[PDB]
Structure 1
Amino acid sequence: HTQILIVEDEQNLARFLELELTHENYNVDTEYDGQDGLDKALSHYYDLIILDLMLPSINGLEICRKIRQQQSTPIIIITAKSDTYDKVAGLDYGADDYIVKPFDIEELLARIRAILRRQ
């Protein structure tokens, strides 16, 4: 059973993502703080981690780099706002995909599938 960690401080969006991913037979853990999210990722192996760029305590870009120092775990960054520099930084720091809002859940789910195929 595939395990996903969501690190998202916007509780409405965190809840939407959890519900939609659970409906696809994913087991989902959620953290609402950037440091709790980093701590959780480093203490348990997930199949894929979704990070919001804009997180409290430590932002998603910096969480991504710290995870990737220690693990090969797939990472997707999602964000409300971002230009090409932000995207390039996120992918260069270890993200496997980088998605700007608004996005349709069907695209997120397909990109998860595409990443997990190769694991």
Structure 2
Amino acid sequence: MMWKIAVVDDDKNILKKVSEKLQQLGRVKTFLTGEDFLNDEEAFHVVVLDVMLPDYSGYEICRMIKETRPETWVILLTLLSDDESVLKGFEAGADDYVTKPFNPEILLARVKRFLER
């Protein structure tokens, strides 16, 4: 079962690191902006989402994803590490909040545990 995974982040380096790591779990699509992702009206099982994006914030895209597909697992991945930012992420409907720099092995495990559901 090769699931559909999406990675949204304006940082080229994050898209490469995350995609090449989650690739073993299935098909991975990478987007540089919220618009690139939104214009790709494909349904994904998991979405690794940056918070500080050039157009739409990660909180808004997360809410939009939940509005459309509540079953979607949304993992916010961001440099924002303060408690206030973590609370805002979950408030937006995020299923997880991971800070950068991150451990790719840990991100893999987090995604895997959701797919098993």
- Tell me if TM exceeds 0.5: yes
Unpaired runs of at least 5, structure 2: none
SS in 1 for 2:67: helix
- Structure 1 segments, 4+ long, off by >2 Å, are none
* Letter of the structure 2 residue corresponding to residue 76 of structure 1: I
Does the 8 Å contact 1:8/1:51 carry over to 2? yes
* Letter of the structure 2 residue corresponding to residue 7 of structure 1: V
* Letter of the structure 1 residue corresponding to residue 28 of structure 2: V
Whether 2:19 is the aligned partner of 1:18: answer: yes
C-alpha offsets along residues 18-54 of structure 1, whole Å, 9 cap, x if unaligned? 11121x24210111011222332xx111110111011
Give the distance between the partners of 1:115 and 1:89, measured in 2 at CA. Answer: 21
The aligned counterpart of 2:95 is 96
Percent of residue pairs identical: 37
Superposition TM-score, scaled by structure 2 size: 0.91
The aligned counterpart of 2:54 is 56
Give the distance between the partners of 1:39 and 1:66, measured in 2 at CA. Answer: 13
Give the distance between the partners of 2:11 and 2:17, measured in 1 at CA. Answer: 10
Q: How many residues align?
A: 115
Give the distance between the partners of 1:39 and 1:12, measured in 2 at CA. Answer: 22
Superposition TM-score, scaled by structure 1 size: 0.90
The aligned counterpart of 2:79 is 80
Give the distance between the partners of 1:20 and 1:110, measured in 2 at CA. Answer: 11
Bigger mean CA deviation after superposition, 6-15 or 30-39: 30-39
The aligned counterpart of 1:27 is 27
Shift of 1:97: 0.4
